[PDB]
Amino acid sequence: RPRNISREESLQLEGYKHACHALLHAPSQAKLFDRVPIRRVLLMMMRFDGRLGFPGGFVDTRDISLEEGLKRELEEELGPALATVEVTEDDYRSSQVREHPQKCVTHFYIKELKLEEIERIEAEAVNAKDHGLEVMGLIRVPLYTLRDRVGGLPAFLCNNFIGNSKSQLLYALRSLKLLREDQIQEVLKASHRL
Amino acid sequence: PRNISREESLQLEGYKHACHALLHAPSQAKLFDRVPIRRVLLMMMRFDGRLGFPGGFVDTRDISLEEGLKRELEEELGPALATVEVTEDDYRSSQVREHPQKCVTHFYIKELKLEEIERIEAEAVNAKDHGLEVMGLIRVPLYTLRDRVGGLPAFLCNNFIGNSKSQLLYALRSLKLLREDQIQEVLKASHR
Ligand SMILES: [Mn+2]
Ligand SMILES: [Mn+2]
Ligand SMILES: [Mn+2]
Ligand SMILES: [Mn+2]
């Protein structure tokens, strides 16, 4: 149902509800089992509704800017550590629009941090206003495929994702150059053997 | 997957052993000041992309099923755990499979104080296994939302390792959190 739309065009519409979500990420030299390289830490979360999503939430664009709304949502959900860390217009990536079930536009941001910054974010998430309520926990996204050819990313893609968050994740994998187009197809295939 | 006994368990030959625990605490918190959380139940995202309970393998002949579990927990949840009891009284059940080379997993349910769960979550990011075997802790939503889908039923549509779903369901019956009919209602809501 979701369709692409430019930021600028989408900011012009009327009586549309807006949401902002961010992928925070950082490179890692860690190797799982000292063999399988982690490569990069991507944060997602388990939401109060039983589903996985990226942090963020609604913004009222007549009151505050998209970035200001995003900063506030992250503070609630991810905690104090998000202060001084500034997701800006540069971090903006894409906008999608729908009408079923509600007139609704979601914006997706992608921001690289230093590893210790992600770690400090994890360490302090348990202190967020939303911890154990709207946010049920923070999780890192496995980017590897294991030898059984299912465990890791393919298996993880069989989890339950809110809205278009799965599709956003896949976008980021292709944009941060982490997987080739075919690799993504391979991942969706290995996943879909239910 | 077939239910078995502790009695037998330790005596079978050629099987690999695994221990897992549900740590849980009561809670007075209300989501949107409306929906009661009731209880906090810990699970995790594994390195394999699946949800499960903390723990792992333990050499049967080396030390007791508790000694293996308590080590596994400390390794996966962090230092805080060295002061968790995890006695025999916390033992719960043992299922036996013949899939990925004959497994036997034992399930443990143990009640803690909310503070204790909170301090565990707070130190989990320090566990030897953080960012490796354990990719993050999560609380299990026990409520069902107004849409009659979000909350627990949606949660059960996630990808679960081994029989950690069976185990979770058992806990909800065992801990008197849900009746059999109510469990049967979330499953139908979920698998729809
Ligand atoms: Mn959110
Ligand atoms: Mn929010
Ligand atoms: Mn909030
Ligand atoms: Mn271990």
Curated annotation (Swiss-Prot), chain A:
Chief place where the protein resides: nucleus
Tissue-specific expression: Detected in ovary, and at very low levels in epithelial cells (at protein level).
Write down the superkingdom of origin: Eukaryota
User: Subcellular localization, per the record?
Assistant: Nucleus; Nucleus, Nucleolus; Nucleus, Nucleoplasm; Cytoplasm
Q: One GO MF term, please?
A: IDP phosphatase activity
Give the reaction(s) catalysed: a 5'-end (N(7)-methyl 5'-triphosphoguanosine)-ribonucleoside in mRNA + H2O = N(7)-methyl-GDP + a 5'-end phospho-ribonucleoside in mRNA + 2 H(+); IDP + H2O = IMP + phosphate + H(+); dIDP + H2O = dIMP + phosphate + H(+); a 5'-end NAD(+)-phospho-ribonucleoside in mRNA + H2O = a 5'-end phospho-ribonucleoside in mRNA + NAD(+) + H(+)
Binding-site list for Mn(2+) 4 = E134
GO annotation, biological process: dITP catabolic process; mRNA catabolic process; NAD-cap decapping; negative regulation of rRNA processing; positive regulation of cell cycle process; sno(s)RNA catabolic process
This chain's protein is named: U8 snoRNA-decapping enzyme
Q: Which residues form the Nudix hydrolase domain?
A: 23-171
Q: Gene name, please? A: nudt16
**What enzyme category does the UniProt record give?**
hydrolase
CDD domains the UniProt entry points to: NUDIX_U8_SnoRNA_DE_Nudt16
Q: Which of this chain's residues are annotated to bind substrate?
A: H21, R47, F54, N164, Q168
Q: Tell me the subunit arrangement.
A: Homodimer.
Residues holding Mn(2+) 1? G56, E77
Organism of origin is: Xenopus laevis (African clawed frog)
Task: Give the pH-dependence text from the record.
Answer: Optimum pH is 8.5-9.
InterPro entries for this protein: NUDIX_hydrolase-like_dom_sf, NUDIX_hydrolase_dom, NudT16
Known EC number(s)? 3.6.1.62, 3.6.1.64
Stated family: Belongs to the Nudix hydrolase family. NUDT16 subfamily.
Task: Name the PROSITE patterns on file.
Answer: NUDIX
Q: Identify the residues that bind Mn(2+) 3.
A: E73, E77, E134
Cofactor(s) this protein cannot do without: Mg(2+); Mn(2+); Co(2+)
